Design a protein around this motif. Structure first.
Motif, short mmCIF file in Angstrom:
data_model
loop_
_atom_site.label_atom_id
_atom_site.label_comp_id
_atom_site.label_asym_id
_atom_site.label_seq_id
_atom_site.Cartn_x
_atom_site.Cartn_y
_atom_site.Cartn_z
N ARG A 30 56.19 -9.93 -2.82
CA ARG A 30 55.02 -9.32 -2.13
C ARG A 30 53.89 -10.35 -2.00
NH1 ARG A 30 50.50 -7.66 -3.55
NH2 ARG A 30 51.00 -7.62 -5.78
N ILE A 31 53.57 -11.08 -3.08
CA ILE A 31 52.39 -12.01 -3.13
C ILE A 31 52.62 -13.18 -2.16
CG2 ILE A 31 51.18 -13.70 -4.57
CD1 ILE A 31 51.72 -11.54 -6.92
N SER B 180 54.58 -13.21 0.62
CA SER B 180 54.45 -12.57 1.96
C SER B 180 52.98 -12.50 2.38
CB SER B 180 55.07 -11.19 1.98
OG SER B 180 56.48 -11.28 2.03
N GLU B 181 52.13 -11.94 1.50
CA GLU B 181 50.68 -11.71 1.75
C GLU B 181 49.94 -13.05 1.83
OE1 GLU B 181 50.45 -7.26 -0.33
OE2 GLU B 181 49.37 -8.94 -1.25
N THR B 182 50.37 -14.06 1.06
CA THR B 182 49.79 -15.44 1.07
C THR B 182 50.01 -16.06 2.46
OG1 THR B 182 50.15 -15.68 -1.30
CG2 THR B 182 49.74 -17.70 -0.09
N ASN C 138 50.62 -14.35 5.25
CA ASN C 138 50.06 -13.42 6.27
C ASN C 138 48.54 -13.61 6.38
OD1 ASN C 138 52.57 -12.39 6.94
ND2 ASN C 138 52.32 -10.47 5.83
N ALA C 139 47.81 -13.49 5.27
CA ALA C 139 46.34 -13.66 5.20
C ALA C 139 45.99 -15.15 5.13
CB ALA C 139 45.78 -12.91 4.00
#
Ligand SMILES: Cc1cc2nc3c(=O)[nH]c(=O)nc-3n(C[C@H](O)[C@H](O)[C@H](O)COP(=O)(O)O)c2cc1C
Ligand SMILES: [Ca+2]
Lengths: 313, 139
Positions: free
Chosen positions: B131-132, B134-136, B138-139
């Protein structure tokens, strides 16, 4: 090549007198992991005399006779397990070594676990009366639940199965003492016996490497066995851990009777059982929920868990 | 373009954790005579090897926290500029030196310390790092 037509003395002594002996070669090293571990455990050498626990007297004197007795009993119980590992367990590993340096590393381990055992004596000398010390020794001798745990592991050290001996050698520093190590961290979270827990932190700094190293050597040997024998060894590990977890729970429920610490101490024990399995290369089946302890206590083990030259740039 | 760069000694704890993650991975070589060149964004995953040293002063000695091979990797400014964040591992039994390769790299690179884990990781660790990362990216 001299190495492939000669044996180390300990191989010569116990397994093969048909070949001449080679001196240890520290100049041509088979496994760099041996040099990494040797350098760290020797550079981490310490003695309990260099941690003065006389500053614990104020917080110790505020504990009632029951809590003082619990600490003396818990620590005398840890002394027994360190005595087992120093005098039998770690020295038994020497003859079953894959490499020459491993023979010397386990001699270091046997000595340093002796230092661990000796450090409880240093705490008792400062804090405890002669009566408290002797009562704790009687209690350890007469406690069947306590005695059952080392009695289950010792046979693997004196038997001829080197892999089962190695698993026992990993399980001792990887699991069996953490139920007791809970207590000093419980107390130091309340500002009680803070210097005593500095000794505990120096012990864990050794035991974490002992567990890792025995786990690493276990994995190199099992990886060479057939898939069938690899599966048999895995079943043996899980069956032994189940039995040892059973014996530990019985013991901790008696040890912490009327103190209410058994629940948390057992969760700390299973947290470490999970790390024992991982350093043997097996997945932990324990949930984060199942191995949870209070945040303020965990911060005493590691604040980094979170309030409680070659660089060119 | 989700990518992991990781280091793992011969014990292969960090290797085994990374092989459980969803994202593609590249291994920093153990051999100090070998280097790699990375031209795409990555999260860096490394173990800690300070060994719980303390200074004369009395604070955590972070010397050797970051494996030499990871320093050699990050010393190449072409490699260094592509690091989105660092995940560090170790063992809580090292106490105040637990996973401190992360804070060291985070400080030196000016990148977030994204996560800390132990040994080969748990199911929960895999799910969280999946999850972390993916979000790293994406953002
Ligand atoms: C010599 C040595 C020193 C270590 N020092 C630390 C440390 O300072 N902090 C920490 O969190 N873990 C420490 N560890 C634990 C390792 O980081 C851990 O075993 C890790 O999972 C190893 O990863 P690898 O097998 O990918 O190299 C140490 C292990 C060894 C053998
Ligand atoms: Ca470890």
């Amino acid at each position: 090549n001299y190495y492939d037509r000669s044996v180390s003395p300990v191989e010569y002594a116990y397994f093969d007198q048909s070949q001449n002996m080679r001196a240890i070669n520290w100049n041509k090293i088979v496994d760099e992991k041996d040099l990494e571990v040797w350098n760290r455990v020797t550079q981490n050498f310490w003695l309990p005399e260099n941690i003065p626990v006389s500053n614990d007297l104020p917080s110790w004197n505020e504990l009632d006779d029951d809590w003082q007795q619990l600490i003396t009993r818990t620590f005398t119980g840890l002394t027994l397990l360190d005595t087992v590992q120093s005098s039998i367990g770690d020295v038994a590993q020497i003859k079953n070594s894959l490499t020459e340096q491993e023979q010397v590393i386990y001699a270091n381990f046997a000595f340093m676990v002796g230092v661990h055992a000796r450090s409880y004596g240093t705490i008792f000398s400062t804090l405890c009366t002669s009566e408290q010390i002797e009562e704790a020794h009687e209690w350890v001798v007469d406690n069947e639940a306590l005695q059952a745990r080392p009695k289950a592991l010792i046979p693997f050290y004196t038997a001829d199965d080197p892999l089962k001996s190695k698993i026992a050698a990993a399980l001792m520093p990887g699991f069996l003492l953490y139920g007791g190590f809970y207590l000093p961290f419980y107390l130091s979270a309340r500002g009680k016996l803070p210097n005593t827990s500095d000794i505990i932190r120096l012990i864990l700094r050794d035991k974490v490497i002992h567990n890792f190293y025995s786990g690493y050597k276990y994995q190199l040997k099992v990886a060479k066995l057939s898939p069938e024998k690899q599966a048999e060894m895995k079943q043996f590990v899980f069956d032994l851990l189940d039995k040892m977890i059973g014996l530990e729970k019985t013991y901790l429920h008696q040890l912490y009777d009327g103190f209410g610490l058994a629940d948390e101490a057992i969760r700390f024990s299973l947290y470490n059982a999970g790390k024992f399995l991982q350093n043997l290369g097996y997945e932990s089946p324990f949930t984060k929920e199942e191995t949870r302890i209070a945040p303020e206590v965990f911060a005493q083990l590691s604040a980094r868990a979170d309030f409680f030259e070659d660089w060119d740039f | 373009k989700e990518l992991i760069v990781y280091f793992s000694t011969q014990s292969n704890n960090t290797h085994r954790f990374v092989q459980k993650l969803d994202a593609e991975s590249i291994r920093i070589p153990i051999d100090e005579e070998e280097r790699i060149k990375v031209d795409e964004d990555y999260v860096l995953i490394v173990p800690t090897y300070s060994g719980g040293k303390v200074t004369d002063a009395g604070q955590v000695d972070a010397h050797g926290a970051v494996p030499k091979q990871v320093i050699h990797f990050l010393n190449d400014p072409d490699n260094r500029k592509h690091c989105l964040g660092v995940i560090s591992s170790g063992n809580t039994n090292f106490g105040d030196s637990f996973a401190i390769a992360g804070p060291v790299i985070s400080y030196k690179l000016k990148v977030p310390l994204l996560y800390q884990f132990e040994l080969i990781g748990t199911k929960e660790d895999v799910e969280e790092v999946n999850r972390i990362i993916s979000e790293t990216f994406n953002a």
